[PDB]
Symmetry: D2
Subunit: 284 residues, 4 copies
């Protein structure tokens, strides 16, 4: 299993042609699962889920989608509320691949997209695994913007290696995971003009009239499927108090919290995350 071998492309319609890049593995397996990566600068599916896709592929047919603005998917200068935008792209991909009701795995921004999708196209979404998800979360005690979000913002205004290293270091409990190579690899991807355009586009999308689409905590009580929430206790981007409204209002919810774990649950506690996901999605 390699990046090149699993790579695939599709063109869908979201107010015009939109190129989506994704990775496909475990093709022969019975159950299809869609993975949606995090939203940090330079983030993409393969690197987001490096410790997970191979293991998950043994039990499931995996589709790891680069969300628009990330990876090798189109990076438009303008778009509406992001999760709905990415959901529309995902809705298009579903019809293309002929998928019915499929479980979704999403961390952070991808979590928000997974949920927005499940609300907008209820018949198409199965079980959810959401790790420190945005949108669905609302920080009842943490003043917004959180420290994590501040460091994201500072990078957007001033995209330097130092600001990106600073951002990555508040993503994780074990800061040794932030290696010089990772910073370099991420900075190289994040600093290109196409990626920086995508970053600005996200910022403007917050000022949209469709902002209420972002506040998914208002709507997830409508979700009928099982939902597994996974959180890092030391998450400084979407801290733990953000899980409570969702945990309360989603009828078939579960929550798992890791101590000594940050926002990057799928990396920091990759083994514990994998087994939990496999079991929750039926063991395939």
């Amino acid at each position: 299993l390699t990046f090149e071998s699993t790579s695939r492309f599709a063109e869908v319609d979201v107010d015009g042609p939109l190129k989506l890049h994704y990775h496909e593995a475990g093709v022969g397996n019975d159950q299809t699962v869609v993975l949606l990566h995090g939203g940090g600068p330079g983030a993409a599916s393969w690197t987001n889920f490096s410790r997970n896709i191979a293991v998950l592929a043994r039990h499931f047919h995996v589709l790891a989608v680069d969300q628009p603005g990330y990876g090798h998917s189109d990076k438009r200068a303008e778009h509406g509320q992001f999760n709905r935008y990415a959901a529309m792209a995902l809705k298009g991909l579903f019809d293309q691949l002929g998928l019915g009701r499929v479980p979704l795995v999403g961390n952070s921004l991808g979590g928000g997209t997974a949920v927005r999708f499940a609300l907008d196209y209820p018949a198409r979404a199965g079980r959810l695994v959401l790790m420190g998800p945005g949108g669905l979360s609302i920080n009842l005690f943490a003043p917004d913007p959180t420290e994590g979000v501040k460091r994201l913002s500072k990078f957007s205004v001033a995209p330097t290696r130092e600001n990106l290293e600073a951002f990555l270091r508040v993503m994780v409990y074990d800061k040794n995971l932030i290696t010089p190579e990772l910073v370099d690899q991420r900075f190289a991807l994040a600093s290109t003009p196409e990626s920086l355009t995508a970053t600005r586009a996200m910022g403007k999308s917050f000022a949209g009239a469709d902002f209420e689409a972002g506040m998914m905590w208002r709507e997830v009580y409508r979700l009928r499927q099982p939902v597994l929430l996974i959180w890092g206790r030391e998450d400084r981007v979407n801290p733990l108090d953000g899980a409570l409204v969702a945990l309360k209002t989603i009828p078939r919810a579960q929550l798992h919290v890791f101590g000594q774990c940050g926002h990057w649950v799928q990396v920091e506690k990759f083994d514990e995350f994998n087994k939990l996901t496999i079991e929750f999605l039926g063991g395939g």
Copy 2:
């Protein structure tokens, strides 16, 4: 595996002879694990863990201990703070069986005992699994006594089948688990004079000068081992807000919450509980 076949007895010293009853299974297995049952009226190890001991025995050497005042262990009229009292009994049993550092599994009252033990004899306790544990929990939002505790109290003053049925029904989310047979079986065990003496003894123990031993949330920051907290979202005895101090202050803590689950986690979500416990304790 049956009740009679696994049954064992030991005599330990807690300010004099104390008969302890327990169940032993999976004798040939590498890792020893101690189970500590819930504190409801008529509660005991076998019935508390009926859906779990057999499955756990395949991976571990299981010791399911009837805590003093319950099952076939001695039911003294007088004792000090209960968790310390039960811990002293357990401390005695450890030395007798020649045990070193052993992981503890305890729900509700047994959870409180497991924790009190881990604090008082730090070298002797390994990993903890605690389901809706007492003592370690403190209800930050729920007014005390909770509805669950009220129904326990009403039974103590007025031990009738109706009050016990009422108590059992707020133990679980799925009330169909409260079958006529269960109520009858529990009432028969709970209503005997020896068991009712034990119930009164518990009540008086709250008035003790050693009450501070009960408030384990003050001390568990001292715990160095991994601790798995498991909660039912609809727990009406020790509600979910009681997990927060422990989750915060125990350095290597985890928390798992089940939606559509009450205080009896090990029964209501018995499969999910078993696999979680097996994985957390090393898969044996």
Copy 3:
């Protein structure tokens, strides 16, 4: 100031003629304030605010309204979602009495109506004082129905003195407030066929398709005015964890919590409550 001297009536249009009963005092004063009472059986403005109306009249022009289904207001057999229904009644009264933009004081169900009114007629509502309010509250930790709501339902099914007294005793921290005279007076009002008619209507309205109007926590982020939330720490109907979404999302919110105080804040902490309200509404 007596019930008789302050008594007033008005007829407004909510899908036809609707009689509203209210109490008026401090007629000469500059600033108008509307009080909206709790939703318990036999509840009405006068008994609900007996400890407050006299004091508030010294500073404000007070209007304490019996909400439809309560007091001497019409008790219809049929109505929609209650808070929207009662708000429509209150809007009609505003126009009749010629009121402009007025601050609102509401505890429990009346809190919900106050909030519902403020959302539906934004130009007409000023500062809000809300005591253990329904609707805007959502219990993030307490399993629903709460102990309070359960005992209300039990009385509704079986309207007996014993069940009402049981209901009343979980309304307050200090149970000595629940005197035989109080139980009898509430029971007499609650046991009339007209009040029983209203109970049936309230029950049926829950099955309505407009239920989402009830979930005001989804909407209060839109409130532009200052809002003072007041809670009893030991509130067993609308517990303290229910304040969190509102405190977070209402931009100019405040929260005051009284220790050793239940659901009936305006009674148990009447003096402290009066001063907070008087100061918060400008000292008049």
Copy 4:
């Protein structure tokens, strides 16, 4: 009322002579009240309480004490756990000035000292007013160190104007309060060798064996007096989730939360804070 007119000195014994600086006003008034300031760099009584001392003096005999290590009080190179250390200083001052049992007002670190004083000398402390207090607070959701505490540490390691300004900007909701004059005045006080001496002492005292004296949340259940907790919703040093253990376990506690207010409650909400304190201490 000026810094010069109110200035006073006293020498007390805490393991030897210790100079305490304080401000005294309202000398003729019946009820004495002690103010204990925050722990920021350059912090002292006068600047901390500039918006309050004049107003409080109208009703109370006010004593605003520079805690050791701050203001014009002795800045020793060595000391034990700070709150116990400062409390011992305050106890000596009480005896010298002949005070009996006095209410205490303390924000942040001074809140911790107030609480520490109230626990160690129970007969000497009256009603407590605590604004975003240290020590009694424990952040159940916010990962430690908080954003505020981090920026304080960064300044301590690298005491530069840029780092201090960064620290000051997370003290308040309204950042316009952080003016160039403020940054310069605090930086000048913080940059003196004596203050740098005190910083080193504070840093070293954390490594002490008496650290558990710092964790006052474990002990405040023993407080018998009324305690008014005041918090800014947007407090980024001691966030709102930190109030919960204290609100729960202090029997006669109250909590007031201001929306659109940070860590410096007495400055940002100075008028609302003054009235709450004046009323809470009896109106004098």
